[PDB]
Amino acid sequence: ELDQLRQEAEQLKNQIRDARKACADATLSQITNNIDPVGRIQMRTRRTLRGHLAKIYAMHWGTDSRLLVSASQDGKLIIWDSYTTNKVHAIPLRSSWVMTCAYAPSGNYVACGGLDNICSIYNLKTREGNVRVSRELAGHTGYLSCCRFLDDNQIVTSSGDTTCALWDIETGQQTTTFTGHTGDVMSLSLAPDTRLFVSGACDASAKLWDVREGMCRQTFTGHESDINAICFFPNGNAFATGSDDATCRLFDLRADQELMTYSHDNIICGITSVSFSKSGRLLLAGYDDFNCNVWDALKADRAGVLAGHDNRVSCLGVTDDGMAVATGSWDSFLKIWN
Template identity: 45%
Template sequence: MPKDDPETTALKKELNDLIAKLKADQEKLADAKLTDKCGDLGDVTKIRLVTKKTLKGHINKVNSVHYSGDSRHCVTGSLDGKLIIWDTWSGNKVQVIPLRSAWVMSVAFAPSGNFVACGGMDNMCTIYDVNNRDSTGAAKMVRELAGYEGFLSSCRFLDDTHILTGSGDMKICVWDLEAGKREMEFDAHAGDVVTISLGPDMKTYVTGSVDKTCKLWDIRDEKAKQTFFGHDADVNSVCYHNSGQAFATASEDKTARLFDIRSDQQIGHYTPPGAGGFTSCALSLSGRYLLAGSDDNDVHSWDTLKVSHTGTLHGHENRVTSISMSPNGVALASCSWDNSVRVWG
C-alpha cells in the first residue's frame, strides 16, 4: 500500500483526535450505567421461544426475511433465485416469484402487504406487485430501479409509492416508485451501507455500515442527524426501538449494542456465550428483549435493561443470516444458510 503524504497523515490524526475528544465529552455526560440504574428491576423470564413452523421450499442459502404489516405473511429471498411469500400461520407458500438474478441479498415487504422488493449483486432494486400476476402466474414485476454502482444491501418501503435503499456504493436513495425515479441520492457512509431500519414515525431511519458507524437520518434531509461510534467491525444490522428513542445494532465484532438517541451514545453492550459474529438483530415490542442472529447457527437473546443473556434459540444448522420480528411482536422469523426459514413463537 502506498504511504500517505504528510498532509493526509496530519488530517487523519486531526480527525482521530476529534473523535477521541467527542468520545471523552460523551463519557463525561454518562453519569450512570444502565445496569446500575436497572439493577433492582425484576428479572425477565428466560426466553422460551420454540419453532412453531419450519418453512421449507428454498433449495439454496436464504439470505433475507421480512414481515408484512399484517404480522402473518413474510417474504424470503434465496440464492436459488426465488422470492417466496409465506403464510407463517399455516406454513404454506402463498407465492413463489422467480428472479432474474439469483444473487439476492435483501428483501422487503411493504407495510400494506401490496408489494415486495428485493436486490443484491445485480446492483438493482426490483419491485413486485403481490396482487397482480404476470402470464406465468407469479407476482408482476412493476419496477426495476437501476443505476447503483454497487450491490443493493438493504431496502425498506416508506409506503406503497416510495422505497429507501442502501448499497455498496456507500449511497442512500429514496425512490418514487410511480415515476421510477430517484427523489434523493446522497453519500451516506465511508463504506458499504449494509442495513436500514425505519423509525416508528416512518420519517426517521438508522443505517449501519462497514465503516463501523451507525447514522440517524430524516428522509426529508440529506445530512445525517447523528453519528454513533463504538463497534470495532462491520455493523451488519440495526433495529429501531419502538419508542423511537433508541436503536439496537448487531456487528461482525461479536457484540450487539443499544444506542440512546437522546444522549447520543451507546448505553448497552451485549456479548454472547458463543464466538460467532452477528448478522442480524431485532427488538421485542416492549424493547426489553434484544435478539441477534449469529454465525454460530443460533439466535441469542438478552434483557436490554439488565444487560444479561436470557437464552439461545437452537434449530438452524448453518449461520443465521436474517431475523424479522412480526409487527405485533408475537413471532420471530429467522432464515439461514441451511436453506430453511423458521417461525418462533
C-alpha cells in the same frame, strides 16, 4: 490548507467526544439492576417454511403479522403463510444473487435486489393475477444490502457503494441521496414514524439520516468491526447495531452514545441479523454460530437460545404484533418460532 482542516477536524472530534462523555452521568447497568430478570425464555419451533433449496438471506414480516416473505439464491422469493404453512406466492427472481427482500407495509409491493445493483419492485396485487416486476431501481455501483419500505411510494435502499439512497417507486429516480460513509453500508432500518433511519456500514459506524432533506444528524462509533445488522427500538428513541465482532450495542439518539453492550466470553461468531420485541425488552440477535440468541435489552444478559438451525442464520424478524419470530438460516429452513 490541509493541515488547518485536519487540526479543525481533530478538535471537533475531541469536543464531540468530550460532550458525549460529559452526559454519561449514570450507566444503564446500575439503572437496570432494579428490575427482576425476565427469566429463561423458551420458544419452540411452531412452524417450518420448508420448500427452499438454497441459502436464505431475508425474512420480512407483513403488517398483519401473518405473511412472511423469504428470499434465497435458488432464484425464487416465496411468500409464506405463517399460520397454515401455505405458500401464497413464488416470485421468480431475475438474478439468483439476493441479500435483501422488503415487504411493503400495505402488502401490495415486494422489493428484492442483490449483486445486480438493482432493487426491483414486485406488485403482489396485479390485476392479471400473476406477480410481476413493478419498478427496477437502478443507479447504484455496489451491492444492495438492505431495502425497507417507508410507504407504498418511497423506499430507502442501502447499497454497498457507500451510498444509502431514498427512491421514488412511481418515477424510479433517487429523490434524495445520503452520503458520508466510507465502507459498504451493510444494514438499514427505518424508524417507526418513517421520517428518519439508521444505517450500519462496513466501516464500524452507524449514522442516522434524515429522510426529508438528506442530512446526517448524529454519528455513532465504538464498534471495532463491520456492522452487519441494525434495527430501531420499539419506541424509536434508540437502536441496536449488530457487529461482526460478536458484539451488538444499544445506541440512543437522545444520549448520542451507546448505552449497553451485548457480549459474552463464549461467543465469537459474527452477528448476521438483529431485531427487537413489541415491548422492546427482548432483542432477538442472530449469530453465525448456528443459533439465534435473545438479549434482554435492559438487563443486557442472555435469556435463551433459539438453537434449531443447522447453519448460520441470515435473518431474524419479529411479527408486527409480537406473536412470532422468523429465523431464516442458510440451511433453507425458515422456522416460525414463538
